[PDB]
Amino acid sequence: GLGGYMLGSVMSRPLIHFGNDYEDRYYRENMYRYPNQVYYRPVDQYSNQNNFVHDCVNITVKQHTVTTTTKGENFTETDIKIMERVVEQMCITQYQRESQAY
Amino acid sequence: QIQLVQSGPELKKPGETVKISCKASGYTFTNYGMNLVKQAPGKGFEWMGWINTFTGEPTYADDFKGRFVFSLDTSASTAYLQINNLKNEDTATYFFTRGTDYWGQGTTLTVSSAKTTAPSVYPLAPVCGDTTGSSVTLGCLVKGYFPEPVTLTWNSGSLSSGVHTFPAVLQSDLYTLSSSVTVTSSTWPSQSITCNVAHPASSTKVDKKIEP
Amino acid sequence: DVVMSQTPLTLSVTIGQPASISCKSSQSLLDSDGKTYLNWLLQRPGQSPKRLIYLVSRLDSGVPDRFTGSGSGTDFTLKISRVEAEDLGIYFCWQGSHFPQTFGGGTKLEIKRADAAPTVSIFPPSSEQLTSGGASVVCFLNNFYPKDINVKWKIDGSERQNGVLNSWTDQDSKDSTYSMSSTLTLTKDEYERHNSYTCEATHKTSTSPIVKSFNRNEC
């Protein structure tokens, strides 16, 4: 499940762009419902970034939907699409941090 | 097709155990958290705790962190609620929910040393208004059973229009329930109307045809 | 333990009119993650609850703009701007912001409809039950409205209360009426000691009670 998975520190949500004015407004209007921190395994346990990121995204999104729906929530396909895009950026950033602290 | 199907009714003695299950389907099981809710007879809803379907970790509300165990079988998309050292206070209907939106049908549990008692089923045929409105109402009397619940249907469920099945009532230490179905004067005694009952707790399942 | 105070216990509204349900928590429902997990559910007769609103004011897919949830901190309100036949049932709030989660007491919502007199039927003891020294006289008062009603039993003209058990159904989803079942149980000994058995209903739709009876002599 979450064995060997650390919880990274809070970080500012990535300002992603959707030129369609609506999704941009939907992202801004709903980001409070999305994660602001991620779950990851020590960076040394991965060969590259793609592996770290792919693993970090799946675990972060899943933990988030089960723990928040327990309290009462609803994640559409839009919500899921936006979340994966957002969490991916945060994971790449979490990767840099782990790689910087050697 | 999102559905949560819980195991059937349970009758247990004080001190015994029970493992109730809920088989989910229609969505990604491990993407939603599961809540467990208790409803004592006549009482309102009480939250027992939840299960992290991704992690498997269960969390118990204060009153349930003693004899309750929540578990999973991720592959089967099934949750389990175990109650050890049953006490009378445990008698109630328990529900599993997907987050906060969908609920299982619930499973009734009764705890008492009292011994199961099958129900007696009596047909109820007219004796008043024959065709003063071309309508005919017949009934089915299910009395003297224990414990709750019992299931009743007219003609194997094929007939379910203009049917009233009332809440059961405690005679003394036995429950009694009745049901009535109204049909057109022509339809009966022409066609046959039968009452179907089943009392889980005592593997009872009877049928009674209604005759003039 | 956050307590959810839901009011009022029952609501009776005419189709097309607005319905307002209140739910106040003893403590702020603003969770630590900045969200407010207040859910609104509807439990129709014979059905399992179904959520209509999450996060105070978000509608679940399929739920009409008629329904709106609002509030914050500790005062919340489920509102239906224009009520309709399908809305009848039990509503209740559920907060998931604090441990443990708690539910409101519930608000039974009744949809008003035209008056209907109860259709009364009486049934003598079944042969099958008399062979065992038991005699039950069942009386159904079906599809009536309003819900206030009063059933009275009479044996050879005298009011009888001992051995009487009643049972009521919730408002019906289809025709919005109420039904009742009254059962008079006595021993075969006593049953055979009396002749006429009467079931009398007292409902707004009639000045005189609506009676139904039979004579043991099958006369």
Curated annotation (Swiss-Prot), chain A:
Carbohydrate attachment residues:
N58, N74
Q: Any S-S bridges, and between which cysteines? A: C56-C91
| Subcellular localization | Cell membrane; Golgi apparatus
Could you name the domain of life of the organism this protein comes from? Eukaryota
The disorder on record is: Found in high quantity in the brain of humans and animals infected with degenerative neurological diseases such as kuru, Creutzfeldt-Jakob disease (CJD), Gerstmann-Straussler syndrome (GSS), scrapie, bovine spongiform encephalopathy (BSE), transmissible mink encephalopathy (TME), etc.
Q: What other note does the entry give for this protein?
A: This protein is produced by a bicistronic gene which also produces the major prion protein/PRNP from an overlapping reading frame.
Family assignment? Belongs to the prion family.
Primary role? Its primary physiological function is unclear. Has cytoprotective activity against internal or environmental stresses. May play a role in neuronal development and synaptic plasticity. May be required for neuronal myelin sheath maintenance. May play a role in iron uptake and iron homeostasis. Soluble oligomers are toxic to cultured neuroblastoma cells and induce apoptosis (in vitro). Association with GPC1 (via its heparan sulfate chains) targets PRNP to lipid rafts. Also provides Cu(2+) or Zn(2+) for the ascorbate-mediated GPC1 deaminase degradation of its heparan sulfate side chains.
**The protein's assembly and partners:** Monomer and homodimer. Has a tendency to aggregate into amyloid fibrils containing a cross-beta spine, formed by a steric zipper of superposed beta-strands. Soluble oligomers may represent an intermediate stage on the path to fibril formation. Copper binding may promote oligomerization. Interacts with GRB2, APP, ERI3/PRNPIP and SYN1. Mislocalized cytosolically exposed PrP interacts with MGRN1; this interaction alters MGRN1 subcellular location and causes lysosomal enlargement. Interacts with KIAA1191.
Q: What is known of its domains?
A: The normal, monomeric form has a mainly alpha-helical structure. The disease-associated, protease-resistant form forms amyloid fibrils containing a cross-beta spine, formed by a steric zipper of superposed beta-strands. Disease mutations may favor intermolecular contacts via short beta strands, and may thereby trigger oligomerization.
Name the chain's protein.
Major prion protein
Say which species the protein is native to: Ovis aries
